[PDB]
Scaffold this active site. Sequence first.
Site, PDB file in Angstrom:
ATOM      1  N   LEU A   9       0.761  -1.010  -0.062  1.00 24.37           N
ATOM      2  CA  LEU A   9      -0.554   0.131  -0.088  1.00 24.37           C
ATOM      3  C   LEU A   9       0.443   1.446  -0.005  1.00 24.37           C
ATOM      4  CD1 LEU A   9      -2.187  -1.197   2.811  1.00 24.37           C
ATOM      5  CD2 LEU A   9      -2.964  -1.022   0.621  1.00 24.37           C
ATOM      6  N   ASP A  10       0.570   2.283  -0.741  1.00 18.08           N
ATOM      7  CA  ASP A  10       1.658   3.168  -0.859  1.00 18.08           C
ATOM      8  C   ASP A  10       0.358   4.255   0.715  1.00 18.08           C
ATOM      9  OD1 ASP A  10      -1.119   4.605  -2.786  1.00 18.08           O
ATOM     10  OD2 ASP A  10      -1.350   4.365  -1.424  1.00 18.08           O
ATOM     11  N   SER A  11       1.485   5.538   0.197  1.00 15.27           N
ATOM     12  CA  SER A  11       1.277   6.548   1.569  1.00 15.27           C
ATOM     13  C   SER A  11      -0.248   7.147   1.679  1.00 15.27           C
ATOM     14  CB  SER A  11       2.947   7.288   1.497  1.00 15.27           C
ATOM     15  OG  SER A  11       2.086   7.988   0.224  1.00 15.27           O
TER      16      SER A  11
ATOM     17  N   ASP B 236      -3.043   5.731   1.248  1.00 16.21           N
ATOM     18  CA  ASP B 236      -3.491   5.003   1.718  1.00 16.21           C
ATOM     19  C   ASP B 236      -3.715   4.519   2.878  1.00 16.21           C
ATOM     20  OD1 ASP B 236      -4.230   3.565  -1.147  1.00 16.21           O
ATOM     21  OD2 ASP B 236      -2.832   2.148  -1.066  1.00 16.21           O
TER      22      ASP B 236
END
Lengths: 126, 119, 157, 104, 170, 88, 66, 78, 178, 166, 111, 55
Positions: free
Chosen positions: F42-44, F46
């Site tokens: 997951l990215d930031s 998210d």
Amino acid sequence: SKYKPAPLATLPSTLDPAEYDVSPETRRAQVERLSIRARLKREYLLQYNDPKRVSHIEDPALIRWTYARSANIYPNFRPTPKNSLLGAVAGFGPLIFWYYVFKTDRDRKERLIQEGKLDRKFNISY
Amino acid sequence: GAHLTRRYLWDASVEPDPEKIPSFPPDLGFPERKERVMVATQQEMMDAQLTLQQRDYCAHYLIRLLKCKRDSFPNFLACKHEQHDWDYCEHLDYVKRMKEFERERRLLQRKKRRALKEA
Amino acid sequence: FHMTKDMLPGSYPRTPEERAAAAKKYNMRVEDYEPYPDDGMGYGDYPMLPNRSQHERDPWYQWDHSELRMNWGEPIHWDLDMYIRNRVDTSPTPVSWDVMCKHLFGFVAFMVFMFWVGHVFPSYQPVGPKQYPYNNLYLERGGDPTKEPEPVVHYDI
Amino acid sequence: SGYTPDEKLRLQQLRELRRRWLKDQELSPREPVLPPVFKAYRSSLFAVSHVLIPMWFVHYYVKYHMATKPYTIVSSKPRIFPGDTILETGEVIPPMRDFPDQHH
Amino acid sequence: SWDKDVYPEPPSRTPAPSPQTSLPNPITYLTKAYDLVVDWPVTLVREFIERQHAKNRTYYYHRQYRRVPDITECKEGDVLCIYEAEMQWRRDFKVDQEIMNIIQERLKACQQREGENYQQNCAKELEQFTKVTKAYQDRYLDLGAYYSARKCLAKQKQRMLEERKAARQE
Amino acid sequence: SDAPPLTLDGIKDRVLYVLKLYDKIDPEKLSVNSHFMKDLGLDSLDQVEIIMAMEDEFGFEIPDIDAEKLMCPQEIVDYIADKKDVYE
Amino acid sequence: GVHIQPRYREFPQLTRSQVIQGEFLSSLMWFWILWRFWHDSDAVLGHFSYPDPSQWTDEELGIPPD
Amino acid sequence: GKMELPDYRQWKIEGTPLETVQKKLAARGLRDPWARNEAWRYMGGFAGNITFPSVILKGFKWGFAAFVVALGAEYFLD
Amino acid sequence: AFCAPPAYLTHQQKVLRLYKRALRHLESWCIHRDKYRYFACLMRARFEEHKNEKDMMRATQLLREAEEEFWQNQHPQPYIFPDSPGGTSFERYECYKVPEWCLDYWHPSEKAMYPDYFSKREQWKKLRMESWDREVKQLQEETSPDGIMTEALPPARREGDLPPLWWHIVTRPRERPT
Amino acid sequence: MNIFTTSILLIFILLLSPILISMSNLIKHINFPLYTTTSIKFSFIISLLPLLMFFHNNMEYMITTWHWVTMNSMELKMSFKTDFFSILFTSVALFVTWSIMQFSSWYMHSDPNINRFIKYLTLFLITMLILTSANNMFQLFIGWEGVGIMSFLLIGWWYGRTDANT
Amino acid sequence: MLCLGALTTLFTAICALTQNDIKKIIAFSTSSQLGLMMVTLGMNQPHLAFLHICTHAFFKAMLFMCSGSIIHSLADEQDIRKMGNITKIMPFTSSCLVIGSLALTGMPFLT
Amino acid sequence: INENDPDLMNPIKRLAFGSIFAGFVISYNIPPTSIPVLTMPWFLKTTALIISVLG
Ligand SMILES: CCCCCCCCCCCCO[C@@H]1O[C@H](CO)[C@@H](O[C@H]2O[C@H](CO)[C@@H](O)[C@H](O)[C@H]2O)[C@H](O)[C@H]1O
Ligand SMILES: CCCCCCCCCCCCO[C@@H]1O[C@H](CO)[C@@H](O[C@H]2O[C@H](CO)[C@@H](O)[C@H](O)[C@H]2O)[C@H](O)[C@H]1O
Ligand SMILES: *C(=O)CCCCCCCCCCCCC
């Protein structure tokens, strides 16, 4: 659109051009400021958590502030045309204004009493 | 009401001034106008402790309503008829005041008509 | 005492070496430190700090002086007691100060102006004045019984 | 980014101590060591103490210290209507006139 | 009791009553319960107290002050004569204050008693309060914190000289 | 008042419960120690929504300075436990 | 105090008392409104007829002819 | 005791207003990954609709029922 | 509240803080959950379209324009959690957060009512007194040479050592004290 | 006029007893919130009698209970205007306060100073009845300023909160 | 008095239309009803203004009680944006809330 | 959620009754005071109900 700052409604940081500056001159200042804060925080906490402390923690900044706002005032006062004019107007100005309000009003009240057109109906206490 | 949008937004000389009523002499148009009758004496209103606002031309009906309320206590719902009688008398009094306003409105109309003919 | 003269506020700094000694006194950087203008109003070398209330200090940080939202040792604004969170707030508002002042006094001025309009164009019902008996209740209203009143007569319409 | 490996370690050590301190805040069964009739009756006994007895004192003060001094208890006059009888004198108020009646 | 002449009260005029409805009046029954549970025991306690009082009957007297020469008859600088005259004037001034209080008390009692009729039935109490207030103002108004018999006399003579001047011009 | 006190197991269950209803996470490979960025990919952006969903779940806010460091469900559980003085 | 158990993400269980007492007071409000409006409808709709000024004859108002 | 949470697999946005939102988002190439986290608010005992008349007219039925019984008494005691 | 802030916020930190604020103020406008979910996804798409901007100078300019846009579309009265700064219950229990050093003034008759609590409290005081000297030494040892300093504190490295400056954290009053 | 006067004076006496008990050591051996609700409850019931006698005969009273100090030709007396406005406000305020005080028991059950909270509400009610029954402006000003101070103390109840103190 | 009351009754009704705190809406309701009392005093109707004090005391106290009932149950939450569906989950509090609102708005034959 | 305490329900229930019947009981017991105007057009008599419903 656009937000216009005022002294009592200041500019948000998010709208401040100086918050988005990343030049190494600014980042060095920001790092230097945090180093001062961190050292002061460490000194405070070492006193705060020390189990042999028996009294409250002396606060040199507060002593300086209360000193600056009392004893340090007069030695650093210089009579200038702006001080002198402000002092005379603030000191005597209201006194003269209120003299004429009370003097004028009381002169009229006496004038009516001498010549009978002041209605003192039930006034018996004064 | 309509009377306000006529006094304003229109001419006002033919519309009554609500404080200057009755402007015309009372006998004007009535030959032997009868004075209004007052049932209750000044003593009766004084003894019933009516407030000065309440001492109008319907005070006799108010006096029975107060009398009924005191006698019918604690049954506070037993004065419906007397309350109705007092209300109706005040209603007729109000209409009487509506007639006076209409009377002046018509007299001012007549004054404007007969003044036009004169000049 | 602990506060020697070198640790307490002094007079306006006249030399760049006095500016540096003053900044070290107040736990500031020499570039950040600046005194009030030399006007002879008693400020001396006390730092002239930005005019922001404590409402604008980070409310999540764990300040040493919790209520004041100050850390121990940092210089105190001259008007701190004016700027405490119980008193004057300088924090940014969603609407510009000038716009609020225009709308508030626009609303007030409009309503005051137009109460006056309602005064010269009143609302009333098409009804004649209320009538009272006995010369308009002359005796009841306190009139002198001895002196005869001016008769007031009401008719039946 | 997340906690540095040092921040992770510190929070673990404080977490161990804090949870032990919070556990220590619980009281033992004996703590605190403290040194040592139907309904409506409770409504009755409150009435005697907090209505009857004070009302004896208030009534005594009103009857024998206030009603015995001029103008201390001044009532407005009762309403007298046409057709009443006044007990103090016995006089009967004459009835009113006739209107005559009216119908809505 | 009190003097019905100093503190006059009109006689009461309470109606019959003549109840119409068949419901019972709760105030009537609550008063009977009150007169038994509350009034009756309180009277017995009072009657016991009054019986004890009559066994230890003592008396007290209202003090009488003989008149002394007025300030008008004192030679100026005669402190012994001024003192007695001044002390007499302070006693009278105090009694004047209580006469004002009696007249205001009658006025307030009458207003409450008359209710909606007060604007007509308080005429005599309002006129007496007006007269007695005029007389009070003439004696004592504007004397100041150091009021005294000498200042009162100077105030009277100033008024008398003005009344005489106005009458002479007539 | 009427709410029960929180528990370490009770917080853990509701923290994993919220994550199991996130379509960008397969429930089966989720454990208390699953790193959001590394293990879960997951990215930031998210992670901002995961915290925002945690605040809604428990009805209290996590300051940004502290929220940016919570990168696995066990960190979230630990944070909520220390805020609310949960100890067992 | 009945010690309702807490519920997670589901509609809880309501006791009979809070439902009945809530339903009784609502019903009492509507009985009163209907019972009063049946007996005192004129208090809402008015009782006395409002006269029309224009339909008053000049003879009633004592207007002399021009 | 120990609160037991409902099985998470039941929170499905089918038939709820959140499905309408997913249709609108899918038109422009987006979907809501949190939609099941909200699904409990729209299904179960919370499923339905609350119309303003239903809130105001609560108790009207038995209030009107009691009204005619009371009206029946007055048309009989008289 | 538990972690001290850094000297400055990196560009990523500033963007993620605007993202959280933007959603939260959107939630205040939308109210309804279905409406909020719709616009929350539209909001994320706007942050995504410029996610891979590598210019930096353009990225900083994009941050400027978004913040200016936020201030104009700000909710005047945004939702605040009850215990958060500006919330209705914020600092509601501070008048009940009595510090632990107050117990040192309790009368012996007061202490005799909790014989077990005040035995454990002695152990915590003995533990505190023994650990202090080591804690001070560790902070002195771990000072960096260059003046650059932060508010982060080190853990206990050795065994039997407690982390430095732990007493004011570990023994602080509960959130709901009474 | 003895039963009427006694009822007006008894309402104040009943409302003072919770305040009096607070100053004794008896407050910690009783359920104080329950005791204070009952005192107000009874005080409302007593207040219904003067309400009924007024609805019947509509008689109004000026009641003087104490002469405080005479300033020459001005007597200051603790006196009460028991008229339409005062009799009906007393019954309404006592009824509402009876609900508020019972509700406070459930609402503030977790507050460690519930007894002080209950005491402050009682003081507010006493100052409000002084305000609405006073026959003279000075006595009215006592109640006027009294409720101001009690509202200050109750608004700033959670006194560690800066916003409450502001 | 007439114009001061009318300005207050309008100004605080405008403010209440967009408030989100349940206690603030009811507070501004109070200022607006007090403004209406001041308007009544300005019309020379002192007994009507007093009769509104007595009737207002009933349904307004209930409204605050019912909101305190809701605030307490929802863990000290006062924002209406985090409420909803109270008519079904709190039947008794909701019924009294609606009764109080109908009395405030002048529903016939209520207080 | 728990609204079953008698210390909550009874006080509210007592004020719900006041909010239904108190106005009627007070209105019919107080002595007559100001003379009301009960004659007016239908749109002045029903103005309060109309604007409330419209709101
Ligand atoms: C309400 C109370 C009112 C307080 C007084 C308000 C009026 C104040 C204005 C006073 C004006 C006179 O102001 C005058 O200014 C000069 C300007 O140098 C000061 O002069 C100052 O420098 C000179 C050198 O030139 C010195 O000799 C002098 O001793 C020093 O004070 C005077 O000391 C001051 O008295
Ligand atoms: C002369 C005075 C007359 C006073 C009148 C008092 C009447 C008292 C009636 C009490 C009613 C109790 O009956 C109650 O009816 C309602 C119907 O609304 C049922 O309630 C059920 O149906 C209703 C529909 O109306 C739904 O809104 C509700 O969610 C559901 O629970 C309750 O389960 C039942 O307990
Ligand atoms: C003329 O009679 C002046 C009276 C003031 C009118 C104000 C407006 C009242 C609104 C009535 C509602 C209309 C429904 C058809």
